[PDB]
Design a binder for this molecule. Structure first.
Ligand SMILES: [Mn+2]
Ligand SMILES: [Mn+2]
Length: 133
């Protein structure tokens, strides 16, 4: 039940290097129902941006929302998730199947690109977690 706006952001210091995720669940009246930031060990930028998506989707599914609007600032995640792009990388293929599995739990979904400054919350959660690694 209900709609959520789920922001996500990855942070990584190498290819791969220490990485973290951040995510924010917002309602329509604009309350932050839940948010998170965590270190994830070593990962690339693109892995972290994907892991933050999955962490946002898991949190929204835990909260039982039925309609999710994803908001992030990674082109690569958006274009792969929507099927515009495909990748040979078997690890990012697996993260997409995982994200799509999660998405199947919602009655509706969408994804929208926001500039990073608009995504400042999730970005601060991921970076503050990574700055403490
Ligand atoms: Mn980002
Ligand atoms: Mn960021």
């Amino acid at each position: 039940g209900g709609r959520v706006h789920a922001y996500f952001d990855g942070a990584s210091r190498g290819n791969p290097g220490p990485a973290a995720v951040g995510w924010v669940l917002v309602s329509g009246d604009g309350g932050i129902v839940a948010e998170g930031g965590d270190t994830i060990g070593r990962a690339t930028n693109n892995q972290a941006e994907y892991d933050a998506l999955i962490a946002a989707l898991e949190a929204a599914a835990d909260f039982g929302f039925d309609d999710i609007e994803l908001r992030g600032d990674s082109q690569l995640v958006e274009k792969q998730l929507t099927g515009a792009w495909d990748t040979n990388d078997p690890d990012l293929r697996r993260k997409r199947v995982r994200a799509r599995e999660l998405l199947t739990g919602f009655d509706d979904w969408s994804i929208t690109h926001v500039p990073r400054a608009t995504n400042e919350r999730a970005d601060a959660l991921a970076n503050e977690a990574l700055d403490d690694a």
